[PDB]
C-alpha cells in the first residue's frame, strides 16, 4: 500500500471545492452549526 504525497493535493482538491449548514446542537439561546465554510 504505497501512498504518495499527491494525497495532499487530494485534500487540497477537496478544501478548495449556496452553502447550507446543519444545526448540531442548540441550548439556552446558543446554536452550533456544522458546515458553512465561507461564513
Amino acid at each position: 500500500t504505497i501512498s504518495a504525497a499527491d494525497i495532499e493535493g487530494a485534500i487540497e482538491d477537496y478544501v478548495s471545492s449556496e452553502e447550507i449548514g446543519t444545526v448540531i446542537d442548540a441550548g439556552d439561546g446558543i446554536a452550533h452549526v456544522e458546515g458553512l465554510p465561507s461564513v
Partner: protein, 50 residues
C-alpha cells in the same frame, strides 16, 4: 477475501498514519460524492474494486 482483508487492514493503518487525512475523511458532511471523488483520487486503482 484474503486480499480484501489485507487491503482493508492497509487502508486502516494508512488512516491511522495520515491523521489529517483521517480527520478530513471523518468530518461529518451531508454530501458524499466529493468524498467518493477524494477516495478515488487517493486509491481508485491501487486496491481492488471491492
Amino acid at each position: 477475501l484474503t486480499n480484501l482483508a489485507d487491503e482493508l487492514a492497509s487502508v486502516a493503518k494508512l488512516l491511522l498514519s495520515e491523521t489529517a487525512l483521517n480527520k478530513h475523511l471523518a468530518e461529518p458532511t451531508d454530501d458524499s460524492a466529493p468524498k467518493v471523488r477524494l477516495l478515488e483520487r487517493l486509491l481508485s486503482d491501487k486496491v481492488s474494486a471491492t
